[PDB]
Design a protein around this ligand. Structure first.
Ligand code: NA
Ligand code: NA
Ligand code: NA
Ligand code: NA
Ligand code: NA
Ligand code: NA
Ligand code: NA
Ligand code: NA
Lengths: 419, 419
């Protein structure tokens, strides 16, 4: 029975030419690849010129982001995320939802806000989220995160030939990420080839090897909204160990995988109440990798449901200590359709055919997939060539990436089998 | 051989989705009338939050505005402005030209800048005017002027059915005035009726009785750009005198017209060198009416050519003195086609059929008329119910309205016959 009241993210006072449109260029059209460094430098500036007001908006956006992330993570696990584990980016999902919110009118608008856990007072427009404020706060926490440390979000907006996008909608989207690619293509004749073209396009414009889904697009789709997230962070002072080392996928089965290892002054503790432990490794001045180990493999589900389901009161802050950390080199790929997660959440028609998204384009779109896809890379900072506590991740565990100032969780996940 | 070097109005560093467009609604579509008070309050805010930088940009914009105003005033008189006299609004003309500049590409762009007396260095984009800076400085001097004192500029942008305007162009225009009315109508079948519809539209949306030209629009026109200016100022302490009083239209002919009269501490002097005199009456805290009388009627042309043709070094600043000023109540209406003034200036094809205005819409427009039309009203501040110098305007004279801080001339003109 929880409710978030993000005052600083609402409209505050209750108060016209025809809207301009364009037609996106075909998906075939030659496009320069995304520059991740450029993106990174932009994001860092947005974070560097923050007022107190901005910090307040950022703390409120973190609350909305985290809550919907935990909720959708739960939905993902209910639906089944595959063998290797699970990964979800609350910022990316939240941004996707806020983008639809900006393109939506009631009843869809209010339903989206209700899903974000913010009360709506019918008749009262000053009770509504200001999506531009929201996306501006979300950009700022993206920047705070990355103060060689990369977080790139690119959006593929794929539309049927002849569907025209509203300028205002697309300009709103740029606040989510400037790496935005509206492209048209035939979605009505060969769904599987359309997905091939989309997957080929994204790989060419990003250079990321993401292992994207192959399933075809529904033939009546006029609009797809796909969000692609690349996170890269270097583990300073970590190097790959020689050889291969047993990783227990369960109590009777092991895989022998490459491990990285390093010693630093990290935070670590054991939660007595629920019998798990946590280790925190800094990834930058504001970014923290949390690594959560259950006491035994069969307790993983209980621990995961506990720590990932709203205020992270489980995050403690002990004095750092000398820890030798050993863990699998993490190269994590995941993808889901937000449509499926919404259906799992008993909201199958929220972005359905009757959704009012009349502020997206010149006609109401028919939304096909809304994909969120991730490539997360935790690289060893040193090439493979002192008393400390040994922490060794050689059975399934949970992880989160966390921004200290706002408290935004940028990723949450579970590793069952690192490959 | 004069040149203006407005550094603060140039682009400074030498450094994409399809452009969005809309189709203007038909001229028949129901429209609320312009609110002059609302406009006035907006303009006053823009003037109230000015930095030093803004003041520098405003002083440079005044120079460009005044120079093109004097030049076009000369062209107007060469072409013949009718019987009653002449009136021209440099800000309105300048804003019209800067608006075309924003919609233009080379060679038209550079030709427009050259007409504004600012050097162009081919290959060097940092030598170009930044039209957004320019229009932002022009808005600020509009506001400074009006700190019951009104200066309203409304723009009628009339386009052939099916011609689509670029969002970016129209957004640029809003910086000139937010009172902007893009409307479509058939220009190809009945030119005279089209002008009737335009004239009817402007009167309905403004309430101003302007006595607009009746001549038809050329049949191949796809775009008309008409600017309409209403100035209203109250002469504090002036009241209409009883009866009618002789006004000499020349040495042998008089008309008996109503006069207003009032006594105040105004500035006044005689220019010995060229044998004319000037009186300055404040209209607000920053606005000044200048009234220039030749010594005799036959010298008017020489005096007009002298004072209106670049730095107003003729404007003096003596201590004010007790003056009884008597003059005709001024209700001045004027209209010209900037196309005609450009032709008079030997630039007939500058906004001609080969003009590159490809940033205005989805096709290159064919520009018909570019009208500037004025209604200037100087009302007596008191209803008709002490030693001073008598100044009485009972023969032809010149007038200007002038903003003190920037030195922008908002109007210049000549009265031969007040009605
Ligand atoms: Na606020
Ligand atoms: Na718009
Ligand atoms: Na607060
Ligand atoms: Na909004
Ligand atoms: Na400047
Ligand atoms: Na645009
Ligand atoms: Na200067
Ligand atoms: Na410009």
């Amino acid at each position: 029975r929880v409710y978030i009241h993000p005052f600083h993210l609402l409209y505050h006072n209750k108060s016209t030419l025809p809207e301009s449109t364009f037609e996106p260029v075909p998906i075939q059209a030659k496009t320069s690849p995304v520059n991740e460094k450029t993106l990174h430098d932009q994001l860092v500036l947005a974070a560097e010129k923050l007022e107190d007001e901005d910090r307040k908006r950022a703390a409120q956006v973190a609350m909305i982001t985290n809550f919907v992330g935990f909720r959708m993570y739960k939905m993902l696990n209910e639906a089944g995320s595959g063998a290797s584990g699970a990964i979800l980016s609350p910022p990316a999902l939240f941004g996707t939802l806020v983008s639809f919110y900006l393109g939506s009118l009631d009843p869809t608008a209010s339903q989206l806000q209700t899903l974000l856990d913010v009360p709506v007072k019918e008749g009262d427009c000053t009770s509504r989220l200001d999506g531009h404020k929201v996306l501006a706060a979300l950009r700022a926490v993206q920047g705070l995160l990355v103060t060689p440390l990369l977080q790139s979000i690119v959006v593929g907006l794929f539309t049927a030939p002849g569907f025209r996008l509203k300028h205002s909608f697309v300009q709103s989207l740029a606040l989510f990420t400037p790496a935005l690619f509206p492209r048209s293509l035939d979605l009505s004749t060969d769904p599987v080839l359309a997905t091939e073209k989309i997957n080929r396009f994204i790989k060419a414009v990003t250079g990321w090897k993401m292992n994207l889904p192959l399933e075809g697009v529904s033939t009546d789709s006029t609009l797809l909204f796909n969000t692609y997230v690349h996170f890269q962070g270097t583990m300073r002072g970590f190097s790959q160990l020689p050889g291969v080392h047993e990783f227990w996928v369960d109590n009777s089965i092991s895989v022998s995988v490459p491990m990285i290892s390093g010693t630093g002054n990290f935070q670590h503790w054991s939660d007595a109440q629920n019998n798990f432990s946590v280790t925190c490794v800094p990834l930058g001045e504001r970014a923290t990798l949390l690594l959560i180990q259950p006491h035994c493999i069969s307790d993983l589900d209980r621990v995961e449901a506990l720590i990932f389901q709203d205020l992270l009161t489980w995050i403690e802050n002990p004095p750092p200590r000398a820890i030798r950390l050993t863990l699998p080199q993490l190269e994590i790929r995941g993808s889901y359709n937000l449509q499926d997660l919404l259906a799992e959440d008993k909201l199958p028609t929220l972005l359905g055919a009757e959704a009012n998204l009349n502020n997206i384009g010149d006609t109401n779109p028919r939304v096909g997939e809304v994909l969120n896809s991730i490539l997360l890379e935790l690289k060893a900072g040193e090439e493979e060539q002192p008393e400390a506590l040994d922490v060794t991740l050689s059975s399934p565990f949970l992880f989160a990436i966390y921004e200290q100032d706002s408290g935004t969780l940028h990723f949450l996940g579970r590793v069952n089998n690192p490959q």
